[PDB]
């Protein structure tokens, strides 16, 4: 009994597979402007945050003040937000970012006593979710190429620096291959 | 590997558990009017349709012309629709009705070739979903008492008559206990 299996398949089939194809176009269009305006470029991939502690805040800035909402991505109804990543008060990147909502379900199950679902169980299933979703996106037609999973365990950490590491690696890959 | 486990837990934790508590109040309020007006009474339970063939139409009337949209249930934002059930053109009942959306995910997986998910697999998981969701609602605090699962296999059938059978049984139970 592993709720993570079905959560990952549902998150892909009922959301990712539907949004990613429109996403690529929406981002190119936005980038025409963003370029001419802020001489910036928004990454073409959806960045999905996977905190293994299953903590999804109501606003990204609360999880890290260097992640600041910039703009909503326009439609060609799906809502998506562009964020800027700061270093020393200066802009270091911009991207479409959001948390994997299924993890909220895992968190809630660990607080629902009838479930018998411990924090240990929650962490094990959060990792299994990440692994399963990765497998799915690896086999998926083009859709996978439109996003990147960012899974991280916080110690007992700079989320913005983690996102920037991926964004800089993505740019490196783009120009080299 | 059973996606039905996680689908049922997600459907409960991320939708049912959140809507049912408001539901009871919304329905009582509506029933004040519906009574004074059409001398009718809307059942206090959410009826969830579970076609085992995982066929979810865009409109109920297309699945059965004797199921006719009557009104949207008001808010105390969650959208819910009240339907009337017809017999010989005459109204035989009214209730809040909707399909279990997770089944759409099962249908889509059976059409997604990379999944290796056959129709046999789809039916097995649709039944497992129904059984798991039933177990959850049986152990759930009060929430279960606000809805009823209607699972049915169509031959190779009157959906409105199936819903009415449940509505009439619910009324019988209400007055006797
Ligand atoms: C029922 C339809 C909701 C779908 C489609 O519309 C959506 C729009 C936006 C947006 N940013 O505007 C986000 C979003 N997120 C989900 N759904 C899951 O995240 C999810 C988690 C699990 C587990 N399974 N699912 C798919 C049902 N949806 C959506
Ligand atoms: C992401 C948030 C969407 C939530 C909350 O808002 C909703 C409102 C209405 C309405 N009638 O107005 C229907 C509905 N249906 C789902 N969600 C699933 O049906 C579902 C299937 C599986 C599997 N897991 N989930 C929960 C995410 N939601 C909602
Ligand atoms: Ca955290
Ligand atoms: Ca059918």
Residue numbers in the entry:
A (entry chain A), B (entry chain A): 153 to 228, 239 to 318, 323 to 343
Could you share sentences copied from the article?
The structure revealed two molecules of compound 2 bound in the cGAMP binding pocket per STING dimer that are in proximity and raised the possibility that covalently linking two such monomers might produce dimeric compounds with higher potency as previously observed. We have discovered a novel series of non-CDN small molecule STING agonists with fused tricyclic core via structure-based drug design (SBDD).
The activated cGAS converts GTP and ATP into 2ʹ, 3ʹ-cyclic guanosine monophosphate–adenosine monophosphate (cGAMP), which binds to STING, leading to its conformational changes and trafficking from the endoplasmic reticulum (ER) to the Golgi to perinuclear endosomes. Consequently, STING recruits tank-binding kinase 1 (TBK1), which phosphorylates IFN regulatory factor 3 (IRF3), leading to its translocation into the nucleus to drive the transcriptional induction of type I interferons and the nuclear factor-κB (NF-κB)-dependent expression of proinflammatory cytokines. Based on our molecular modeling analysis, along with the reported CDN-STING crystal structures, we designed a novel series of fused tricyclic heterocycle compounds and analyzed their binding to human STING with thermal shift assays and the potency in activation of STING signaling with a reporter cellular assay.
